[PDB]
C-alpha cells in the first residue's frame, strides 16, 4: 500500500538517469586510415579507435584502443606511378638522357590521372574492409565522425629526383579529400597527415609503435612515475628497434641516463621535436635510416659489388659465398623465381630488376650527381658509372653465371666491406650523414645505449626462425654472436639437391628451397655483423629480441610492428591540435 | 560650485579606478651574448614590457633597442683549446687523445669558463649602470634579465663532447650572478645554446625585416585576405651576411617557387621560428663555413700559394694584393707598419688557418672514420696525417707579392671559395639542406625577393669605390660597373710617404692610407662580383640588391644592429604564453636555493 512509493523512487530515478546522461562522457567508434606508400607497393591500413566526448572537454581518442582491423592489397607503388608518367611524357629511356624538368609542368593533369587510378583502387579496398568488418550500428558512428587519412611515403620515392614527388603529394591529397559520395565514408586529409616521411621519422614512428604495444610507453601511473622533483620517468625501460624493410633499414634507440654525445651526432628529444606531448616521459633518441640496406635494395647492390671483384668473378663465373652449393643463376640483379624444377628464373624486365632504383638515382642527368662529385664517387665505388646508359648501369660486366659457394665467413666479410662498413656512404644517404652516421659501423661507435633492442623485418625474423626450426639455435636465443655464426655456418654449408619434389636444402635435416629463402644467408651475415657492431659499443643493450608481433591485453596482437601506429599516435596524443583538425574542421572543411 | 569640489572627489575615484583597470608599462633589460669565432661579447638591450589585468605580461617587440655591444673577450674555441692544452697535453692537434679520460677534468673546465663569464658579467653590469637612471634601474632590477648566450662558427665544428659540456657549465655560471650588483640575470637550455648556421641566418633575416618594418602582424605591416590568410604588406627581404668564420645566405621564396626534393626550405610557422599570427614564409637558409673574413683569408693563401700558377721560386704571386705590397708567406695576422712593411704574427692561436688545420686532423673522428671529410681537407692542400705546424705551413714559400690583378683575383676566389670541386670542410649542414657550395644556392633555388648585403668588409668594398668616385651614389648592384671600378682600384700602387704607407690610385685618381684592415680588401671585391654573377644567373632575380651598414629606426637613429641578436630575442619574446611562463612565472626565482 505505502510500499508502492517505489513508483516515486522510479520517477526520480528516470530523471536522475537522464541528468547523468547529460553530464557524463560519451564513447563513439572512429575509423582511421594509414596508407603505406612503400618501395614495392601502396597498401591501405584500416584501424578502429574509441573516441570520448566530455561536456566542456571536447572529443579525444583513447590511445590504448587503437587496433588494426586489416592491412589491404598491394597496389602500384608511387615510384611506378611516377616512372610510368615520365615514360609517357618525358619519353622512354629518360634514365639515360638529359631531361628538361620545366617542360614536365605541362603534364600535371596527366600525373593527376595516373594518381587517380591508384587512389580509386585503394579507396575501393578501404571501403570493402570497412563494409565487411563492421556491423550496422558501428557503421553509423564511423560514417558520422569522419575518417582521417594518413598517406606517407618511405624509401621508394625518398630519393626521387626533381619536383615530381612533391607535386604528386599535392594531387594525392586533393584525390583523398574528394572520395566517392556513394559509400558514405567521410575520408579526409591535410599536408600534416599526408606527406613523405623522412627515414629518421619512419624510424621514430616504429619506436613509438613498439613501446606503445608492449606497454613500455605511457603517461598514466601504471606505466610512469613522477619523482620528488616533478620529473616523469617511465616505470619500464623504453626499447629501441632495428627494422629492415624492402628498400631501407632503420636503427632507433633511446639514450640512457642523459648521456653526453659527440657534437657531430644529432639525437632527438621526443618533446622538443613535438613527437610526443609534454605529459609523456622525456627521451633523447638516436634515429638513423640507411638507403640500400633494405631486402631488395641490398640484394641488387651486393651482387653488383661482389661480382665486380676479381676474387669472386673469374672466367664468366661469379662465385657467391652467400648462396648455397648447387645453386646457380643468370648473372643479373633481376627478381629471382625458384621454379619447381630446381632452376632459378631471373626476371629480365627492367622495372623488376633490384638495381633499378639505385641505377635511376646514379645518373649524370640527375642534378644530384651532375653537380656533386661526392655523389658520383659514391655511385662509382658501388660499381655504377652514372655516365653509362641505364641498361649497362645495372649490368654485371663479363659475368654469365652466378654460382653459390656456401661459405658463411666469406659472406660475413663481404657483407661487412660492401654494406655495413663501406669506404664511402652507400648512395642517397645524406640524411644519415647529416645526423653524424655515414654507415652502420659508425652507429654503435659514436652512440651506444643500455636500452633493450628489438630486431624486426620479415627476413630478419626468417633468419632466426629457420635456424630455430632445424634445432641449430636454442628457442630462447638472445643474440649470442658466436652461437648464431656457428648455426648459420652449418646451415649455409648445406648442399642444394634437385629431387623429384624439387630443390631441397640438405643439413647433416632438410627444408625446401624457394624464392623467399634462396638468399637468406646474406641476411644471417647482416644480423651477425650488426650484433658484432652492437657488442663493440661502450654501452650494450640489456637484451636483444626478435619479435614477429607484440601480444595485446587478450593475448592477441592489437596491431603490427612498424611506423603506422606511431604516425597515428604522433597526431592523436596532441589532444588540442587533434580536436581542431579532426573534429572542428574535419571532413566538412571540404564542403564545396 | 561645491558641485566642482564633489567633481574633484569623483575624479580622485576615477583616477584610481583607471589605474587598476589599465595596462602598466615597465622597462626590462635583455642580454644577448655573442659567442662568435673571433670573440665572446655582450649585447645589452632594453624593451618595454606591458602588464594587463587577466592578460599577464609581454614585451612590445617594436620597443626592442640596443644600448651597447660590449668588449671583445676570449672566444669559446680558445677557452676549450686552452683547457685541452693543460689536460690532454700540449700539441693534442698532432697526436691521438682518449676523449673518455678528459671527463675527470670537467671541474677544471668550469674554472676556465668562470674567468670568462665574470668578465662578461662585469661588462654587462657597467653597461647597465652607465645607461640607466635610478628609476629605470629599479624596474630593470625587479623584472629579471634574460640572457641568451649563443655560439656560432668558432665552436660549430668543435670535436668530441667538449663544447656541449661547456654549455651546461656556462648556464650554471649565468644562473648564479654576483648578488652585490642586484641585476637578476638568468638563463635556460632554450636561450643558451649553440645555434646552427641555418638558425644564425634565419635570426639575421628576422632582424632585417623587423627593423625595416617589413615583418609585422598588425594592419600597418600585414593584410588578411577574404580566405583568412595573413599576408605581409611589403615583400620580406633576404640577407647575405659575411662574418669572421662563416657566411649566411637567406631569402624568402615567392610562391610558388619550384623546389627539388633535395632542397630543404624552412617554413617559419611550421618550424616554430615565428608565432602563427605572423604572415607565413618559406625561407631558404644556408651557412657556409670557411667563407667568413678570417677563415677565408687563411684558406685562400693555402690554396693560392700551393698552386704552381702562383708559387714559383719561393714567391707567391697574389692577384688580390696591391702592386708594391709584400708579406712573409704564412696565414698569420697581418699588421701594416708605418714604414710600408707588413708584420705577420707567428703565434699559432693568431694564425687564420688554425681552426681549419685543427678540424682537418687524422685524430679527429670526423676525418679518421669519414674519407669524405679527409678528401675535402686534402683538396684544400691540408694533409690530416701531418703535425699542426706543417698542416698550417705554405710549403716552399717565403714571400707573398701582390700583383694587383683583379680578374685573376675573381678567378681564384671563384675556384677556391665560391665554386670549389668539393664542398669546403665542415659543411655537412649546408650539404644536408641541398647545397655543396655558394654557386648551387642560386641554381637550385632563387627568389625575386629584395636582397641586403651585410658584413664589415662587404660594405667597405662598395664604400671605398664610391669615395674615389669609381662607383655612383646610385650603385644598384651592376656586376660590370663594379668589376670595372674594382679593376681600377685594385691595380693601385703601394707608395711609402712621410706620413705613412699609401694606396695610390692609377691615372691620378687620388689615394688613401694603407692599413691592416684594407690591404686585402680586393679579395672581398672579387667575392662580391662572384656572388652578384651567381645571383644574376638565377631563374629569378632579386628585385633590388642593397648594401647597408645599419637600418634607420623611427626618429632617425637606428634602434639596433643587423645580425642574429634581435632575431633570437624575437624568436623567444613573440611566443607570448611561453615567454610569460619562462620569463615571468619561473624567472630568476627558479634559481633560488
UniProtKB/Swiss-Prot annotation, chain A:
Molecular-function GO terms, alphabetical: nucleoside diphosphate phosphatase activity; ribonucleoside triphosphate phosphatase activity
Top-rank lineage group of the source organism: Eukaryota
EC numbers for this chain: 3.6.1.15
GO terms under cellular component: membrane; symbiont-containing vacuole
GO biological processes: nucleoside diphosphate catabolic process
Residues at the active site: 202 (proton acceptor)
Main subcellular location of this protein, as a coarse class: secreted
Catalytic activity: a ribonucleoside 5'-triphosphate + H2O = a ribonucleoside 5'-diphosphate + phosphate + H(+)
Glycosylation site residues: 398
Family according to the record: Belongs to the GDA1/CD39 NTPase family.
Protein name: Nucleoside-triphosphatase 2
UniProt organism field: Toxoplasma gondii
UniProtKB/Swiss-Prot annotation, chain B:
Gene Ontology biological-process entries: nucleoside diphosphate catabolic process
Record localization: Secreted; Parasitophorous vacuole
EC number: 3.6.1.15
PANTHER family membership: ADENOSINE/GUANOSINE DIPHOSPHATASE, GUANOSINE-DIPHOSPHATASE
Physiological role: May perform an important processing step in the conversion of high energy nucleotides prior to uptake by the parasite. NTPAse-II has a specific activity 4.5-fold lower than NTPAse-I in hydrolysis of ATP. The primary difference between these isozymes lies in their ability to hydrolyze nucleoside triphosphate versus diphosphate substrates. While NTPAse-II hydrolyzes ATP to ADP and ADP to AMP at almost the same rate, NTPAse-I hydrolyzes ADP to AMP at a much slower rate (0.7% of the rate for ATP).
SUBUNIT field: Homotetramer.
Record protein name field: Nucleoside-triphosphatase 2
Taxonomic placement: Eukaryota, Sar, Alveolata, Apicomplexa, Conoidasida
Amino acid at each position: 500500500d505505502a510500499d508502492t512509493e517505489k513508483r516515486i523512487n522510479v520517477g526520480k530515478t528516470h530523471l536522475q538517469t537522464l541528468r547523468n546522461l547529460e553530464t557524463r562522457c560519451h564513447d563513439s567508434l572512429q575509423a582511421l586510415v594509414v596508407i603505406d606508400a612503400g618501395s614495392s607497393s601502396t597498401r591501405t591500413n584500416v584501424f578502429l579507435a574509441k573516441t570520448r566526448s566530455c561536456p566542456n572537454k571536447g572529443r579525444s581518442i583513447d590511445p590504448d584502443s587503437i587496433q588494426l582491423i586489416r592491412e589491404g592489397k598491394r597496389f602500384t607503388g608511387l615510384r611506378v606511378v611516377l616512372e610510368e608518367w615520365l615514360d609517357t611524357y618525358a619519353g622512354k629511356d629518360w634514365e639515360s638522357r638529359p631531361v628538361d624538368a620545366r617542360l614536365l609542368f605541362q603534364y600535371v593533369p596527366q600525373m593527376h590521372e595516373g594518381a587517380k587510378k591508384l587512389m580509386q583502387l585503394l579507396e575501393e579496398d578501404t571501403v570493402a574492409i570497412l563494409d565487411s568488418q563492421l556491423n550496422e550500428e558501428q557503421k553509423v558512428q564511423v560514417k558520422a565522425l569522419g575518417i582521417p587519412v594518413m598517406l606517407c611515403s618511405t624509401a621508394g620515392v625518398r630519393d626521387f629526383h626533381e619536383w615530381y614527388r612533391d607535386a604528386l603529394f599535392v594531387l594525392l591529397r586533393h584525390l583523398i579529400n574528394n572520395p566517392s559520395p556513394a559509400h558514405g565514408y567521410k575520408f579526409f586529409t591535410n599536408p600534416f597527415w599526408t606527406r613523405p616521411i623522412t627515414g629518421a621519422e619512419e624510424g621514430l614512428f616504429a619506436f613509438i609503435t613498439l613501446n606503445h604495444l608492449s606497454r613500455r610507453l605511457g603517461e598514466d601511473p601504471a606505466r610512469s612515475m613522477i619523482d620528488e622533483y616533478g620529473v616523469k620517468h617511465s616505470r619500464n625501460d623504453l626499447a629501441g628497434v632495428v627494422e629492415v624493410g624492402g628498400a631501407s633499414a632503420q636503427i632507433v634507440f633511446p639514450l640512457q641516463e642523459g648521456t653526453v654525445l659527440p657534437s657531430s651526432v644529432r639525437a632527438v628529444n621526443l618533446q622538443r621535436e613535438r613527437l610526443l606531448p609534454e605529459r609523456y616521459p622525456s627521451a633523447d633518441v638516436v634515429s638513423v635510416s640507411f638507403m640500400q640496406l633494405g631486402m631488395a635494395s641490398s640484394a641488387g647492390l651486393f651482387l653488383k659489388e661482389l661480382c665486380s671483384n676479381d676474387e669472386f668473378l673469374q672466367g664468366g663465373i661469379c662465385s657467391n659465398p652467400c648462396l648455397f652449393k648447387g645453386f646457380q643463376q643468370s648473372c643479373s640483379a633481376g627478381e629471382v623465381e625458384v621454379r619447381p624444377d630446381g632452376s632459378a628464373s631471373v626476371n629480365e624486365d627492367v622495372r623488376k630488376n633490384r638495381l633499378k632504383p639505385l641505377a635511376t638515382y646514379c645518373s649524370v642527368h640527375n642534378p644530384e650527381i651532375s653537380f656533386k662529385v661526392t655523389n658520383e664517387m659514391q655511385c662509382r665505388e658501388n660499381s655504377i658509372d652514372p655516365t653509362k646508359p641505364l641498361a649497362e648501369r645495372m649490368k654485371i660486366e663479363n659475368c654469365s653465371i652466378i654460382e653459390g659457394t656456401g661459405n658463411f665467413d666469406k659472406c660475413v666479410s663481404q657483407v661487412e666491406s660492401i654494406l655495413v662498413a663501406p669506404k664511402l656512404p652507400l648512395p642517397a644517404n645524406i640524411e644519415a650523414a647529416s645526423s653524424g652516421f655515414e654507415s652502420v659501423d659508425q652507429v654503435f661507435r659514436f652512440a651506444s645505449s643500455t636500452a633493450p633492442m628489438f630486431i624486426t623485418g620479415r627476413e630478419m625474423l626468417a633468419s632466426i626462425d629457420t635456424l630455430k626450426d632445424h634445432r641449430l639455435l636454442r628457442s630462447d636465443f638472445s643474440g649470442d654472436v658466436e652461437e648464431l655464426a656457428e648455426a648459420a655456418r652449418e646451415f649455409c654449408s648445406s648442399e642444394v639437391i634437385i629431387r623429384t619434389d624439387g630443390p631441397v636444402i640438405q643439413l647433416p635435416g632438410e627444408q625446401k628451397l624457394n624464392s623467399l629463402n634462396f638468399d637468406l644467408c646474406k641476411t644471417m651475415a647482416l644480423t651477425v655483423s650488426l650484433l658484432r657492431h652492437m657488442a663493440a659499443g661502450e654501452n650494450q643493450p640489456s637484451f636483444i629480441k626478435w619479435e614477429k608481433s607484440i601480444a595485446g591485453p587478450d593475448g592477441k596482437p592489437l596491431a603490427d610492428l612498424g611506423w603506422q601506429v606511431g604516425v597515428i599516435l604522433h597526431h592523436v596524443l596532441f589532444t588540442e591540435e587533434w580536436g581542431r583538425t579532426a573534429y572542428e574542421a574535419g571532413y566538412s572543411h571540404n564542403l564545396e
